Amino acid sequence: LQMIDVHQLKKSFGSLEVLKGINVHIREGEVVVVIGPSGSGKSTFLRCLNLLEDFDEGEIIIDGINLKAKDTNLNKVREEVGMVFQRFNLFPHMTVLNNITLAPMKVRKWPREKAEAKAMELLDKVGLKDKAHAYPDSLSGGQAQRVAIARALAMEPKIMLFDEPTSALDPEMVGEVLSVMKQLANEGMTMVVVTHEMGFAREVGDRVLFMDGGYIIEEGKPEDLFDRPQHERTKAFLSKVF
Amino acid sequence: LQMIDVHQLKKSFGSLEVLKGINVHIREGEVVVVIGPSGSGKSTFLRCLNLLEDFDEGEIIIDGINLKAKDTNLNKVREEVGMVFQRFNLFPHMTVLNNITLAPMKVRKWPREKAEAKAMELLDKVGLKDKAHAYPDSLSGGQAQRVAIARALAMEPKIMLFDEPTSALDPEMVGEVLSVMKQLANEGMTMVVVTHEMGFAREVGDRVLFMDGGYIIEEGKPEDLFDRPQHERTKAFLSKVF
Ligand SMILES: Nc1ncnc2c1ncn2[C@@H]1O[C@H](COP(=O)(O)OP(=O)(O)NP(=O)(O)O)[C@@H](O)[C@H]1O
Ligand SMILES: Nc1ncnc2c1ncn2[C@@H]1O[C@H](COP(=O)(O)OP(=O)(O)NP(=O)(O)O)[C@@H](O)[C@H]1O
Ligand SMILES: [Mg+2]
Ligand SMILES: [Mg+2]
Numbered sequence: 001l002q003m004i005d006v007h008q009l010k011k012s013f014g015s016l017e018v019l020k021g022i023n024v025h026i027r028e029g030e031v032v033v034v035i036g037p038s039g040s041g042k043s044t045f046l047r048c049l050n051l052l053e054d055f056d057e058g059e060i061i062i063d064g065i066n067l068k069a070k071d072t073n074l075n076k077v078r079e080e081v082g083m084v085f086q087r088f089n090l091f092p093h094m095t096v097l098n099n100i101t102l103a104p105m106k107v108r109k110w111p112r113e114k115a116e117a118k119a120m121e122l123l124d125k126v127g128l129k130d131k132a133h134a135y136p137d138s139l140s141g142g143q144a145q146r147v148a149i150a151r152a153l154a155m156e157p158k159i160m161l162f163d164e165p166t167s168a169l170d171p172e173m174v175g176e177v178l179s180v181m182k183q184l185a186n187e188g189m190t191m192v193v194v195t196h197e198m199g200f201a202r203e204v205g206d207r208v209l210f211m212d213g214g215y216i217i218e219e220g221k222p223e224d225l226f227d228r229p230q231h232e233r234t235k236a237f238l239s240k241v242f
Numbered sequence: 243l244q245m246i247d248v249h250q251l252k253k254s255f256g257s258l259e260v261l262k263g264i265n266v267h268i269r270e271g272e273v274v275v276v277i278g279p280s281g282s283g284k285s286t287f288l289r290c291l292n293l294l295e296d297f298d299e300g301e302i303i304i305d306g307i308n309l310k311a312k313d314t315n316l317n318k319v320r321e322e323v324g325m326v327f328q329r330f331n332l333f334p335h336m337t338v339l340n341n342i343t344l345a346p347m348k349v350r351k352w353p354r355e356k357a358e359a360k361a362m363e364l365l366d367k368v369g370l371k372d373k374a375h376a377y378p379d380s381l382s383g384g385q386a387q388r389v390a391i392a393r394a395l396a397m398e399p400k401i402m403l404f405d406e407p408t409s410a411l412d413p414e415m416v417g418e419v420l421s422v423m424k425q426l427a428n429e430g431m432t433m434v435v436v437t438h439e440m441g442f443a444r445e446v447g448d449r450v451l452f453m454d455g456g457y458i459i460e461e462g463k464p465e466d467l468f469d470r471p472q473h474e475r476t477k478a479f480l481s482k483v484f
Binding site: 094 | 285289292294325327328329330331332333334335377378379405406
């Protein structure tokens with residue numbers, strides 16, 4: 001019933017315990033925003049959610065399937081969780097269209113015509129249908145990140161992870177990437193977004209999770225955490241950024 | 243006697259002819275710079291060399307292998323031709339190190355220990371040994387492009403293709419990238435470089451090809467084509483990049 005469930009998740013990289021046991025339970029259709037200083041383990045957490053990194057202690061069950069359960073097919077899981085990174089979301093050697101159908105064809109064995117019918121719909125939905133036969137290098141940062149999203153949505157995931165999707169964009173390119181995301185939030189997509197775009201969080205986020213030094217130090221509805229933070233660390237952090 | 247041999251090379255997309263027949267003969271250890279306005283067919287040309295695109299008429303023989311030859315094995319030409327793009331040169335879900343070892347292991351079938359060796363070297367060779375375990379999102383454009391080179395070098399290519407490797411970099415970061423390319427040239431690497439960074443060409447380019455609308459309008463040593471261009475078009479292009 002809970003789309004994403006994490007119990008005392010712990011993760012260490014050598015002599016450094018990056019995650020020190022965190023608890024996260026995200027309901028289906030819930031949009032969760034994660035914030036916090038560099039090195040607080042935000043990326044590591046996301047990488048564990050879509051089986052890109054392995055964890056030490058605690059357990060992660062997404063959509064009711066324990067990632068450590070002996071039977072569970074780790075690929076069905078990966079297939080249902082999509083991810084958009086800060087950069088490097090596309091293959092520069094193929095067209096926008098081909099970037100999008102690559103996985104649906106290889107992983108889902110969809111015939112080309114089917115994959116493309118689906119790819120063009122998505123592309124048309126982020127306003128870049130006319131970029132189908134272009135290469136990534138010809139796209140602005142704003143168009144590329146939209147293509148990146150369309151590409152992840154092509155696998156029709158149940159979950160969508162975003163690791164600083166607009167962070168590396170020129171300020172004017174931010175808006176277009178954020179509106180596509182809010183629409184995703186509007187259609188009930190379960191979402192976890194690592195971002196420091198306040199506006200997006202206030203208007204679309206259900207909860208904000210403040211991470212600092214391996215722990216989720218505070219959480220709450222966006223309004224409450226931003227305007228009336230209860231923990232001294234949240235305050236210090238907030239005052240230093242945005 | 244010939245690393246790259248291209249004859250009457252013609253490429254068309256639908257009813258539009260992008261490469262109207264070009265002839266290029268590059269010898270091992272040579273460095274050719276390609277310049278020209280948007281749509282000249284520069285990228286299409288590089289892609290034809292790296293088996294990333296197929297072609298209509300004419301012929302192409304890499305390191306003595308005719309790509310249209312029924313016999314000859316293409317995918318061994320692929321391993322021999324490296325290529326750095328303007329952007330998206332890295333996998334975001336992987337560590338730098340892993341970005342570099344991936345292909346060697348997967349393609350050449352190298353053992354992990356071996357691959358990771360070749361990787362750490364190329365890394366230190368580009369000034370990024372301390373970042374072998376970091377993720378791409380943490381690299382600056384310049385660092386990212388350098389890792390990109392290491393990643394293509396790991397495969398031990400006989401040829402290196404560059405498509406505007408510094409075009410999307412802030413001015414401060416172009417320098418560090420051109421440098422790695424300069425070294426590669428001095429080490430006798432057959433190179434084809436699409437770049438509007440005129441200095442680099444004059445500094446290590448044996449020849450410069452000015453491309454305009456499907457044809458190679460003019461060419462010659464850097465100093466010549468740049469200081470005294472014979473064609474009105476070359477003269478006109480250079481003026482806008484003055
Ligand atoms: N192989 C590794 N993978 C991920 N993290 C690592 C690794 N090795 C060391 N670390 C450390 O793990 C800690 C947390 O990393 P991370 O999850 O990327 O923090 P972060 O919040 O995403 N940083 P930023 O992305 O700058 O906010 C950092 O100190 C990393 O240096
Ligand atoms: N499917 C396709 N793949 C690649 N190119 C295509 C395709 N369809 C049409 N084209 C056209 O191929 C022509 C040449 O492109 P290209 O080789 O990238 O020129 P260019 O010099 O690299 N452009 P720029 O990189 O802006 O200088 C362009 O007009 C493209 O629109
Ligand atoms: Mg991060
Ligand atoms: Mg190009």
